[PDB]
Amino acid sequence: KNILVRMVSEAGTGFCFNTKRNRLREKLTLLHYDPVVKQRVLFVEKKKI
Amino acid sequence: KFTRSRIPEKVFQASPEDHEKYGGDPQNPHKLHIVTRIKSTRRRPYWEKDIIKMLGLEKAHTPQVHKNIPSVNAKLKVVKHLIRIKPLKLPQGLPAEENMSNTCLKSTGELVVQW
Amino acid sequence: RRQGIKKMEGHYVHAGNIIATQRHFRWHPGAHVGVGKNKCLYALEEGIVRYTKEVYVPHPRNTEAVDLITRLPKGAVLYKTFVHVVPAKPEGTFKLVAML
RNA sequence: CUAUGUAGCAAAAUAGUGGGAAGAUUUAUAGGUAGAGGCGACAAACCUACCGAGCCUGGUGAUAGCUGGUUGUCCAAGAUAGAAUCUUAGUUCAACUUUAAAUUUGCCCACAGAACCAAAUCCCCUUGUAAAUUUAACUGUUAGUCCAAAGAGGAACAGCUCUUUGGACACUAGGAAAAAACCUUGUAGAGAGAGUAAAAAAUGAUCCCAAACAUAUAACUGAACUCCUCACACCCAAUUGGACCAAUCUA
RNA sequence: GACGAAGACCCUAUGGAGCUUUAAUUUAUUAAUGCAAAACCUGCAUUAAAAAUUUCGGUUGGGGCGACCUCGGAGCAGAACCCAACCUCCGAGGCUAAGACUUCACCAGUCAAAGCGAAGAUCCAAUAACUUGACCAACGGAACAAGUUACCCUAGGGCAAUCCUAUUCUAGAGUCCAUAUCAACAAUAGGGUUUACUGGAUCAGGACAUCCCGAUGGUGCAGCCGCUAUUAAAGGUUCGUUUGUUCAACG
Ligand SMILES: [Mg+2]
Ligand SMILES: [Mg+2]
Ligand SMILES: [Mg+2]
Ligand SMILES: [Mg+2]
Ligand SMILES: [Mg+2]
Ligand SMILES: [Mg+2]
Ligand SMILES: [Mg+2]
Ligand SMILES: [Mg+2]
Ligand SMILES: [Mg+2]
Ligand SMILES: [Mg+2]
Ligand SMILES: [Mg+2]
Ligand SMILES: [Mg+2]
Ligand SMILES: [Mg+2]
């Protein structure tokens, strides 16, 4: 029902963390915190886990 | 289970019938208790072995003196069935720095000088 | 599990020390006693712990309590227990630093 | 098949009664098959008296959470929470125990205090006490029995499994007949001294089971408890500390 | 009679040796092929047989069958903490930092003022990485191992809920009537019920709750005998067919 996916950022790359998403939902994007620059950036999924 | 016993205070209330039965008096009570052990600590719970070890009553009869203040009575109300308490009587007053080495305690509980 | 008092009345509790671990709200927080997410009570300010009985006036934001108090007769009140820490030391002192 | 014999005459025999006895018979002589192998009219039968796997030497002082043992004198502290484990016949950690060392509080404990849904318990000022915590260093015990009590299981029984509070035992001594578990009692030696503690019954199957006693004043008897004269380290298991030392060799 | 001086049966061991396999791991050896090597051998791979090494988790009706095995919530555990269950009823698989709590060890686990910034273990492999997963659910986890030993060997351990029977109220009956008989339930007494989810011969000692013989009461026996009741343990208490949880039937 739910899948853990490694979400990665765009600006200040290299971040990786397994967040949750309902499998019935499409590809996910969020606005959250990048600590390399400590700013709000759009994070997007890359590959399901 | 088996537990410590909290004696109701109602028992420790001398009556007008008890007062003339023992040589005592409500007013002007007595300074010191002379206490002796007449029963074994063995076969009794540890919270009585320790009390007896604390009041100096380790040996058998071997009388020993204690204050008549509630801090000690609370201890004697736990071991009241393994001891005899009598009131020390001083019909000649406390001895002086002379007559300390010539005192004597009679079986009636009176401390006296020079036998 | 050990969900009971861990600092009893008249005990010297420093900052952050847990006063009581509980399941339900047996002991509500009082003066200088903070609550955690698990309802643990901990001592915010160094001092001496006391327990008291006070009147209960729940948050209106809460619902399971704001309505029960609405079901009580005239002259009624919900009393409940609280655990406070009377602070011991003062906040600070002033000392000579420079004589210019 | 029976009897004798059972360290016997014999580590399988003797006496009788029996099956075969010109055959797939029986037998002397030399040779062959060799051990996870041989041989087997398969019975796990036999391979030098003991073969579901010979015997000897070596690896080998195999390994053994199992059984059995473990050697001079004397003294002292010293016992039944628990957790995990191809684990409950054992180990490791903890708890308890011991020694040495540092420091200052430890135990008992009234008043106050601990929730909405009976016993008691927890916590501390004082008080009686002198112990407790900490550090350094090791071993040993560990899932015990009975009795009083409150519960759960089997009736509220089966002398029943289990949890909890306490006591005793595995330590001395006296009593209830004998008696680990009930009652009395602890710190230890000598005495041809003394005082006590507990402690006596009322009104089915070998052979009953102390003997007796209705009425002379309630006191006495009774310990390693206590006192007395003298002397003192001189009555626990596992474990731990200490003081001595027999005999031999050497300087 | 001195539990008088070999052989069995039950349980245990992370003992041993096996047997079978559709239990795990292997193809080293052989046989087929297939591919390279100069008509045969050498090397590699796949498939099979033949073997080879290896293991048999835990709590339990009565051992087996069958369940469960980690974590969480309610009574036992009435009032700080803790306390068992194959006892009782159900589900789950932002960074930094004073102080503390804890599932009685450890390993894990839990709360958190201020301050700065935004609003189910270890090992292994793939990995630049930021770190990552399944199994480990026998849930403190051997990386991968089952069924079974009637041929087995060694070390070792070994005051009855439901009921049977007699006495109490007679109350129900008995052609009239409780007592001439059963005497229902119950109560008071003495005695057992283990499986499912050891006789015979020989010699017998003893009790009486007496089968006979002996003594006595009543009778509805008008009488021997019958019936019940009291007393009585000196004596006696058969031979056979069929069969051997041991009785039962039959002459
Ligand atoms: Mg050995
Ligand atoms: Mg073992
Ligand atoms: Mg000693
Ligand atoms: Mg206090
Ligand atoms: Mg003595
Ligand atoms: Mg084992
Ligand atoms: Mg084995
Ligand atoms: Mg529970
Ligand atoms: Mg537990
Ligand atoms: Mg812990
Ligand atoms: Mg903050
Ligand atoms: Mg396991
Ligand atoms: Mg486990």
Swiss-Prot record, chain A:
Keywords: Mitochondrion, Ribonucleoprotein, Ribosomal protein, Transit peptide. Component of the mitochondrial large ribosomal subunit (mt-LSU). Mature mammalian 55S mitochondrial ribosomes consist of a small (28S) and a large (39S) subunit. The 28S small subunit contains a 12S ribosomal RNA (12S mt-rRNA) and 30 different proteins. The 39S large subunit contains a 16S rRNA (16S mt-rRNA), a copy of mitochondrial valine transfer RNA (mt-tRNA(Val)), which plays an integral structural role, and 52 different proteins. It comes from the Eukaryota. The keyword Membrane does not apply. One of its GO terms (cellular component) is mitochondrial inner membrane. It is found in: Mitochondrion. The chain holds residues 14 to 62 of 65 of the full protein. The gene is MRPL33. This is Large ribosomal subunit protein bL33m. GO terms for biological process: mitochondrial translation. It comes from Homo sapiens (Human). Belongs to the bacterial ribosomal protein bL33 family. GO terms for molecular function: structural constituent of ribosome.
Swiss-Prot record, chain B:
One of its GO terms (cellular component) is mitochondrion. Keywords: Mitochondrion, Ribonucleoprotein, Ribosomal protein, Transit peptide. Component of the mitochondrial large ribosomal subunit (mt-LSU). Mature mammalian 55S mitochondrial ribosomes consist of a small (28S) and a large (39S) subunit. The 28S small subunit contains a 12S ribosomal RNA (12S mt-rRNA) and 30 different proteins. The 39S large subunit contains a 16S rRNA (16S mt-rRNA), a copy of mitochondrial valine transfer RNA (mt-tRNA(Val)), which plays an integral structural role, and 52 different proteins. One of its GO terms (molecular function) is structural constituent of ribosome. It is found in: Mitochondrion. GO terms for biological process: mitochondrial translation. Belongs to the universal ribosomal protein uL30 family. The chain holds residues 35 to 149 of 161 of the full protein. This is Large ribosomal subunit protein uL30m. Transmembrane segments: none annotated. It comes from Homo sapiens.
UniProtKB/Swiss-Prot annotation, chain C:
GO terms for biological process: mitochondrial translation; translation. Keywords: Mitochondrion, Ribonucleoprotein, Ribosomal protein, Transit peptide. It is found in: Mitochondrion. It comes from Homo sapiens (Human). GO terms for cellular component: mitochondrial inner membrane; mitochondrial large ribosomal subunit; mitochondrion. Belongs to the bacterial ribosomal protein bL27 family. This is Large ribosomal subunit protein bL27m. The gene is MRPL27. One of its GO terms (molecular function) is RNA binding. The keyword Isomerase does not apply. Component of the mitochondrial large ribosomal subunit (mt-LSU). Mature mammalian 55S mitochondrial ribosomes consist of a small (28S) and a large (39S) subunit. The 28S small subunit contains a 12S ribosomal RNA (12S mt-rRNA) and 30 different proteins. The 39S large subunit contains a 16S rRNA (16S mt-rRNA), a copy of mitochondrial valine transfer RNA (mt-tRNA(Val)), which plays an integral structural role, and 52 different proteins.
